[PDB]
Amino acid sequence: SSLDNIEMAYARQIYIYNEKIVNGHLQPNLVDLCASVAELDDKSISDMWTMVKQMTDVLLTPATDALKNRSSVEVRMEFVRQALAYLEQSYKNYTLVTVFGNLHQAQLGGVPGTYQLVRSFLNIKLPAPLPGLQDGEVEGHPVWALIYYCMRCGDLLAASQVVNRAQHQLGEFKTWFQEYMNSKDRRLSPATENKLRLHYRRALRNNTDPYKRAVYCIIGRCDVTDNQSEVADKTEDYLWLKLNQVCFDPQDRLTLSQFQKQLLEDYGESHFTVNQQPFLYFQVLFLTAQFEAAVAFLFRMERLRCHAVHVALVLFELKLLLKSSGQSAQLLSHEPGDPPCLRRLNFVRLLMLYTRKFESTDPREALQYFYFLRDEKDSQGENMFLRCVSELVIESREFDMILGKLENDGSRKPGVIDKFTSDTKPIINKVASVAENKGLFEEAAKLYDLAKNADKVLELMNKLLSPVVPQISAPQSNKERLKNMALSIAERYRAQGISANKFVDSTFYLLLDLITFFDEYHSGHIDRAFDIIERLKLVPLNQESVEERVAAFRNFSDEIRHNLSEVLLATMNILFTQFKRDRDSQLRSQARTLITFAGMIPYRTSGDTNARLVQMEVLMN
Amino acid sequence: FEQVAGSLTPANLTTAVEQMISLKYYAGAIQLCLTVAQQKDRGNTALSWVNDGKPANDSRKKAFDERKICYNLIHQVLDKLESDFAGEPELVDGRPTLAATKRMEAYNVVNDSSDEVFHFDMYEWYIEKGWTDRILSIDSPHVITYLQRLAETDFRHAEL
Numbered sequence A: 001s002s003l004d005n006i007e008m009a010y011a012r013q014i015y016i017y018n019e020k021i022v023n024g025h026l027q028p029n030l031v032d033l034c035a036s037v038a039e040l041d042d043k044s045i046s047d048m049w050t051m052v053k054q055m056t057d058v059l060l061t062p063a064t065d066a067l068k069n070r071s072s073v074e075v076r077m078e079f080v081r082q083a084l085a086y087l088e089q090s091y092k093n094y095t096l097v098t099v100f101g102n103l104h105q106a107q108l109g110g111v112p113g114t115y116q117l118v119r120s121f122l123n124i125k126l127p128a129p130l131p132g133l134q135d136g137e138v139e140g141h142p143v144w145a146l147i148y149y150c151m152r153c154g155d156l157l158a159a160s161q162v163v164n165r166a167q168h169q170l171g172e173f174k175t176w177f178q179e180y181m182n183s184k185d186r187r188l189s190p191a192t193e194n195k196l197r198l199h200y201r202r203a204l205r206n207n208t209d210p211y212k213r214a215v216y217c218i219i220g221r222c223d224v225t226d227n228q229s230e231v232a233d234k235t236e237d238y239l240w241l242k243l244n245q246v247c248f249d250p251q252d253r254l255t256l257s258q259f260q261k262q263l264l265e266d267y268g269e270s271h272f273t274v275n276q277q278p279f280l281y282f283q284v285l286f287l288t289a290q291f292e293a294a295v296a297f298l299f300r301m302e303r304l305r306c307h308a309v310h311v312a313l314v315l316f317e318l319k320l321l322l323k324s325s326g327q328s329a330q331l332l333s334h335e336p337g338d339p340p341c342l343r344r345l346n347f348v349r350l351l352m353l354y355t356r357k358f359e360s361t362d363p364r365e366a367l368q369y370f371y372f373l374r375d376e377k378d379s380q381g382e383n384m385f386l387r388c389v390s391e392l393v394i395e396s397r398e399f400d401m402i403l404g405k406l407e408n409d410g411s412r413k414p415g416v417i418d419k420f421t422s423d424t425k426p427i428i429n430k431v432a433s434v435a436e437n438k439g440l441f442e443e444a445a446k447l448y449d450l451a452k453n454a455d456k457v458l459e460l461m462n463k464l465l466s467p468v469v470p471q472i473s474a475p476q477s478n479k480e481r482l483k484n485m486a487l488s489i490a491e492r493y494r495a496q497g498i499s500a501n502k503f504v505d506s507t508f509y510l511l512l513d514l515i516t517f518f519d520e521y522h523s524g525h526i527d528r529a530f531d532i533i534e535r536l537k538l539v540p541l542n543q544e545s546v547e548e549r550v551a552a553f554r555n556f557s558d559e560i561r562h563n564l565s566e567v568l569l570a571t572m573n574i575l576f577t578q579f580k581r582d583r584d585s586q587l588r589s590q591a592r593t594l595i596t597f598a599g600m601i602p603y604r605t606s607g608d609t610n611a612r613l614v615q616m617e618v619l620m621n
Numbered sequence B: 001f002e003q004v005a006g007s008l009t010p011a012n013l014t015t016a017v018e019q020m021i022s023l024k025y026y027a028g029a030i031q032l033c034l035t036v037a038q039q040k041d042r043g044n045t046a047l048s049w050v051n052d053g054k055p056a057n058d059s060r061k062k063a064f065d066e067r068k069i070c071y072n073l074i075h076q077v078l079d080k081l082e083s084d085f086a087g088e089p090e091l092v093d094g095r096p097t098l099a100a101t102k103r104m105e106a107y108n109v110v111n112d113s114s115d116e117v118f119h120f121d122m123y124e125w126y127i128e129k130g131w132t133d134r135i136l137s138i139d140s141p142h143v144i145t146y147l148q149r150l151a152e153t154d155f156r157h158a159e160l
Helices: A005-022 A030-038 A043-056 A066-071 A073-099 A103-109 A114-125 A143-153 A156-164 A173-182 A190-203 A210-219 A235-243 A256-266 A278-286 A291-300 A305-316 A347-358 A363-373 A384-396 A399-404 A425-437 A441-450 A454-468 A478-495 A502-521 A526-536 A543-553 A564-580 A583-600 A606-620 B002-007 B010-022 B026-039 B045-050 B061-084 B098-111 B116-129 B142-150 B155-159
Strands: B090-092
Touching: A005 A030, A005 A305, A005 A363, A005 B061, A030 A043, A030 A305, A043 A073, A043 A278, A043 A305, A066 A073, A066 B098, A073 A103, A073 A114, A073 A143, A073 A235, A114 A143, A114 A156, A143 A156, A143 A210, A156 A173, A173 A190, A173 A210, A190 A210, A235 A278, A256 A278, A278 A291, A291 A305, A291 A347, A291 B090, A305 A347, A305 A363, A305 B090, A305 B098, A347 A363, A347 B098, A363 A384, A363 A399, A363 B098, A384 A399, A384 A425, A399 A425, A399 A441, A425 A441, A425 A454, A441 A454, A441 A478, A454 A478, A454 A502, A478 A502, A502 A526, A502 A564, A526 A564, A543 A583, A564 A583, A564 A606, A583 A606, B002 B026, B010 B026, B010 B061, B026 B061, B026 B098, B026 B116, B045 B061, B045 B116, B061 B098, B061 B116, B090 B098, B116 B142
Parallel strands: none
Antiparallel strands: none
16 A cells, blocks of 8 residues: 555545535535544644644635636635634643643643733743833732733733723824724724824834834834834744735835735745744745645645645635646646635645555555535546546556456446446547557457447457357367357346347357357267258358359358358368268268369458368268 | 436435545546536426426426426535535645636636536525625626516525
8 A cells, every 4th residue: 555644544534525525415524524634744734734624614605616716705715814823822722832831731720811821922022121101000010011912812801901001101103003993804993094004114113122113013014024023023923014004005014915926926835834843834925825725735745735725725626726727737836817825736636646556566655635616627528537547547456346257147237437427438448449459359358248239249259259269179278268258248148138230239249259269179979060060051052052152152251251261161171071981972062062163252361271171071981 | 426417316425525525536426417417407397397387297307307406416416515614724735626627617617617507506505605705706696687586585585
C-alpha cells in the first residue's frame, strides 16, 4: 500500500462522503469529515481545519457560480470578520496557555473572565512597569494595555468595562469607543471617525505609550503603514492588526485587494518561509481569502500534500474554489480576462497528481477521488471520471476488482465502479477497445463479453479459433484454453439467446463444428468425424452439389477459407483410410468430388493440396 | 437517451438516473429528466391544467403525471448530491474543489430551465425541504405571482 497512516484515514472519510452521495443521502459537512482525522495527528493540523471551517462558514447563495460568490463585496466582507474572529479566538488560547501551563489546567479551575485573564496575562508579559505608559493604571495595570489585549482577544465588552473605570482619565475616548462597540463592521461614523483621527494625527502621531497608539488606529483604521511593531510582534498580530484596518470605498487607506496582493507579491513565500514553518504562510493566504494560492503553496510541501488536496475539495464542494477552465494551464494562474488580484487553481491537474501516487496498488481509494471530477469534461468530450477509470484500468489491469468479474456461468458480480454509475457499457468498451488495439484478443473478448457485446466477442473469437482449427487439442494447449472458452461462450449465448449478425455468428458456430471435426479426426474416430463434415455441407461429396458449394465458398468468412486446405486433406485422408478397410464405388465417387471442388476453388496451398488429393484418389483404384 | 426522450418509460428512466447518480453525473441526470418531461408534453397540456386549477376528470392529468415522475427523480439527484458531499469543503487551498463544481454545474442546469411546471414544482419542493435560504433569494416576480395565488390556502405559503 502506497498510503501513509494519515492519507489512509482521509481516504476512508472520503469513501463515506461518496457513499452518502452515491445513495442520495444528506450532503454531510466535508470540512467536518476531514477534521475527524486531523485530531489523530498533532495540533498543527487540527488548528488548520479549525481555520478552514471558520473561513468557509459564511452564508452563501446555493446554486450560484463560484466566481460570483468570491467577487461579491457581500461575501468578501464576511471573510474578514470570520478571520478576525479566528485571530482573536486563536490569540485568546495563546493567552490561556501563557497563564496556565495546559488548556486542561485552565479548564479545571475554570476559564476566568476575559478581563481577569488579560489582567493575569499582563502580569507575566510585563512584570515591571514601562516608563512610557500614559493615562495611569486600572487595578494595577496600564489602562491601554488592558484595552488592547482585550480587543485582541475579541471581547470588546471586557475592554469597555476597563474604560468605565477610567472615565476621568481617558477624556473624550469614552464616547468614541462606545460608538465603535455599537456600530457594526468595526467602523465608526465618518464624522466621529474624522474627529478622532485628526486628534491622533494632531499631537499623538508619536506617543510614548505604544498601546495607546495601537488602540487609536485600530478604532480609526489609520496609519496603515505603521505596523505598530511595538505591540504586534507576531505574525497573527500583524494580520489581525491589518484586517482591522482594511477599508471599502484615498490617502492613508488600505483595501483587502491591496493588502492581499501587497502581501504575497512583495513579501512572497520567501519572506514567510525563512523560519522553515510552512503553515505560517498558509494562514497568511487563507485568512486573506487567497484560497487558491494557499492551496497550491501547501500542495507543494511533500509532507502536506494530503492536507492541501482536501482543503481544496472543501472549497470545491462549497462552490468557493475558482477552477481553471483550461486543463493545459499551470497549477496556479490568473485568467487573462479576470482581475489581477484573484488567482485560479487547475483543480483537474491537482487531483491527477495526488492520484498517480496511490493509483497503482490502491485503486479503490483512487476512484473515490476521481469522483469529484464527474462534473468536468475534456476537449474531446469524454467524462473526466469515466476517462480516469479507463486509464486506471488500462494501467492497473484490475478487471475483476474494478469492472466486475463475469464468471463462465453467466453471472456478473458488480465492480467498484458500479457504485458510481450504472451505465458501465462505454468504459468496458473503452478498456476492451484499447486491449483489442494491442493484439490482446483473448482479453478483449473477455472484456467485450463482460459488456455483452457479442458483435465484438464473436469477431475476436473467430480470429483466435481459425489458426487453431486443424491443430492438435492437447492438455493445457492453446487449443483447449481457447476451445473451452469458446464453448463456455456458446452455451451462455444460446441459453441467453444472444447472437451477433449472422455473418460473424455463422462463422463462429461453424468453426466450433470444425474444431470438433479435427478433434474427432486426430483421435481416430473416423466414422464419427466423417458424419460431422457431412452435416456442415461445406465440402461437396456428390457431383450435383459442386455448383452450389463452390458458389458458397465465395462469400464465406476468410477465417474459413484459410482452413479449407486442411479440411479437404482430412476429409480425403478419412475416405482414404475407410477405403483400405458398392461401397468402393461410393468412396471413389466422393473422392472425385473433393478433387473437382478443390480444382475450381482458389485457396491456401492449393498447389500442394490439390496434388496430394489426386494421389490419394489414385491409390484407391 | 435524449434522442429517445419522448419514448422512455418510467422504469428505464429511473434506472438510468440512478446509475448516473452513482457515477457523480448529477447535471447529466437532471438534464435528461427535464428533456423527457418536455418531450412527453410539447403542447404544455400540464401548464394549462395547473393554470386551470387541476379540474378532476380532465385528461391532461396524464401529461402532468409524466412530468412529475421526471421532477421527482430530479429531487433525488439533488438530494443525493448534498448527501454525497456532506462535509466536503467548497474551497481548498483557495480555488474550488471538484465536489463544489458539480454542485454549481447541477444547480446551473436547474436555473437554466424554461419549464414552468418544473419551476413551480421546485418552489413547492424548496418550501417542503425548508430552504427559505434559496427561495427568498430568487428575486423573480414569477415566484411572487405563484405565491399570490396559493397564499389564501396555506399558512406556510402566506408567510413566504
